[PDB]
């Protein structure tokens, strides 16, 4: 396995290790999404670790209109966060 | 880029004061840093924790305490916060140990 | 560093490890892009190892119009590949 | 999902035939598999290699050779190819060793 491949693979693992508690097995429900944010990325939530923003975030990620976060929509979130971080480091050198 | 020079020792307990929080309710802290591969990175939460707090503890007054600075914590840290109005800070600190690998 | 965090951070390192050979240090040039495709993801190219699809891929990712793949455009490529892979696994169950 | 049952031994050289390449020039091969965290994933190129070729060698006739199948190679493999016309294959094989952890 190559370095970049491992990075991409780990994202799939993290997802599959959270989605499957309820609702489906390949989709993140509202309950599972909260657990994910309360573990993997705890701090991005303006509400600390409560709901509120979690519910709004779900509606923001939900593009198909099922109230469930699929990998196709979840990967966008991850990509956006990483992109913004890199861009920040790019302008950090100046 | 500008960074403050901080001479440290391996295995020495250091305390750092990271300002940025105004006279408003505790907002989200998008902690970051500048490194090559970046090992010591972890988004902090005012209500939640994670694999990092066990190493570096954040005091309620806005300070970071390191029980023993090694060679992994040797780099350029950046205590950045993020307000819902789009407000952050460009604070960079460079720690350097006497025993560099 | 959390698991999802490590995954995201690894992508950054991989990028910064290939970008900085020429042109810039925070942007992937055509030359470096080829090296990346011939190491991290060697096999996604129909040209095998040739610069045929590489030139086209560069112009595909180049959205800013400067012929230089930035992390903002690069992350989209990574996200797309990962999304397609997971979606395939979803249908792989049936 | 269906997968063929293959009984193997730890440290045994196994050779598998992965068909899919039609009577046309060697196209890109998007090799994949189905695992938990997935450690044995690596895209193969008909004109390139990488950190996996040293483990599993691909014969020009379209076959995979494993010098010594261990516990890392134990799972469900999928030799998939991708033609520039939208053509692939859902071939799955499940290898199982006698000495499992």
From Swiss-Prot, chains A, C:
Q: What SUPFAM superfamilies would the database entry show?
A: EF-hand
* Record's protein name: Protein S100-P
Q: What does this protein do?
A: May function as calcium sensor and contribute to cellular calcium signaling. In a calcium-dependent manner, functions by interacting with other proteins, such as EZR and PPP5C, and indirectly plays a role in physiological processes like the formation of microvilli in epithelial cells. May stimulate cell proliferation in an autocrine manner via activation of the receptor for activated glycation end products (RAGE).
Which terms in the GO cellular component ontology are assigned?
A: cytoplasm; extracellular exosome; extracellular region; microvillus membrane; nucleoplasm; nucleus; secretory granule lumen
- Subunit details for this protein? Homodimer and heterodimer with S100A1. Interacts with S100PBP and S100Z. Interacts with CACYBP in a calcium-dependent manner. Dimeric form binds to and activates EZR/Ezrin by unmasking its F-actin binding sites. Interacts with PPP5C (via TPR repeats); the interaction is calcium-dependent and modulates PPP5C activity.
Does Metal-binding count among this protein's keywords?
yes
What does the record say mutating residue 68 to K does?
In S100Ppa; permanently active, interacts with EZR and PPP5C in absence of calcium
Residue stretches spanning the membrane: none
| Binding positions for Ca(2+) 1 per the UniProt entry | 25, 27, 32
Tell me more from the record: This protein binds two calcium ions.
Q: Pfam families this protein is in? A: S_100 (PF01023)
Q: Which PANTHER family match?
A: PROTEIN S100-P, S100 CALCIUM-BINDING PROTEIN
> Which organism's genome codes for this protein?
Homo sapiens
PROSITE patterns in the cross-refs: EF_HAND_2, S100_CABP
Q: Which GO terms describe its molecular function?
A: cadherin binding; calcium ion binding; calcium-dependent protein binding; magnesium ion binding; protein homodimerization activity; transition metal ion binding
Swiss-Prot record, chains B, D:
Please list the disulfide bridges.
Answer: 18-79
Subcellular localization, as worded in the UniProt entry: Cell membrane; Cell projection, Phagocytic cup; Early endosome; Nucleus
Domain Ig-like V-type spans what residues? Answer: 3-96
Q: How is expression of this protein distributed across tissues?
A: Endothelial cells. Increased expression in pre-term labor and preeclampsia placentas compared to controls.
| Modification after translation (UniProt) | Phosphorylated on its cytoplasmic domain by PKCzeta/PRKCZ upon ligand binding. Phosphorylated by ATM following DNA damage. Targeted by the ubiquitin E3 ligase subunit FBXO10 to mediate its ubiquitination and degradation.
Q: Which residues are glycosylated?
A: 5, 61
Superkingdom of source: Eukaryota
Induction details: Induced in T cells by antigen stimulation and by the S100B ligand. Induced in trophoblasts by DNA damage.
Function, as annotated? Cell surface pattern recognition receptor that senses endogenous stress signals with a broad ligand repertoire including advanced glycation end products, S100 proteins, high-mobility group box 1 protein/HMGB1, amyloid beta/APP oligomers, nucleic acids, histones, phospholipids and glycosaminoglycans. Advanced glycosylation end products are nonenzymatically glycosylated proteins which accumulate in vascular tissue in aging and at an accelerated rate in diabetes.
Q: How does it assemble?
A: Constitutive homodimer; disulfide-linked. Forms homooligomers. Interacts with S100A1 and APP. Interacts with S100B, S100A12 and S100A14. Interacts with TIRAP. Interacts with HMGB1. Interacts with LGP2; this interaction plays an important role in AGER-mediated pro-inflammatory responses and cytokine release. Interacts with double-strand break repair protein MRE11 which is a core component of the MRN complex. The interaction enhances MRE11 endonuclease activity and promotes DNA repair.
User: What protein is this chain from?
Assistant: Advanced glycosylation end product-specific receptor
Q: Taxonomic lineage per UniProt? A: Eukaryota, Metazoa, Chordata, Craniata, Vertebrata
């Amino acid at each position: 396995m190559t370095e970049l491949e491992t990075a991409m693979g780990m994202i799939i693992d993290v997802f599959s290790r959270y989605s499957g508690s309820e609702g489906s097995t390949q989709t993140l429900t509202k309950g599972e999404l909260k657990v994910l944010m309360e573990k993997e990325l705890p701090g991005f939530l303006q509400s600390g670790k409560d709901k509120d923003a979690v519910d709004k975030l779900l509606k923001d990620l939900d593009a198909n209109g099922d109230a469930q976060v699929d990998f196709s929509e979840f990967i966008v979130f991850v990509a956006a966060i990483t992109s913004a971080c890199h861009k920040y480091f790019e302008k950090a050198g100046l | 880029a500008m960074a403050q020079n901080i001479t440290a020792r391996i295995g020495e307990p250091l305390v750092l004061k990271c300002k940025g929080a105004p006279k408003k309710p505790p907002q989200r802290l998008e902690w970051k840093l500048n490194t090559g591969r970046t090992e010591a990175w972890k988004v902090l939460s005012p209500q939640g924790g994670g694999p990092w707090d066990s190493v570096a503890r954040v005091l309620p007054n806005g300070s970071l305490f390191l029980p023993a600075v090694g060679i992994q914590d040797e780099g350029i840290f950046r205590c950045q916060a993020m307000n819902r109005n789009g407000k952050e800070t460009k604070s960079n600190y460079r720690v350097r140990v006497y025993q560099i690998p």
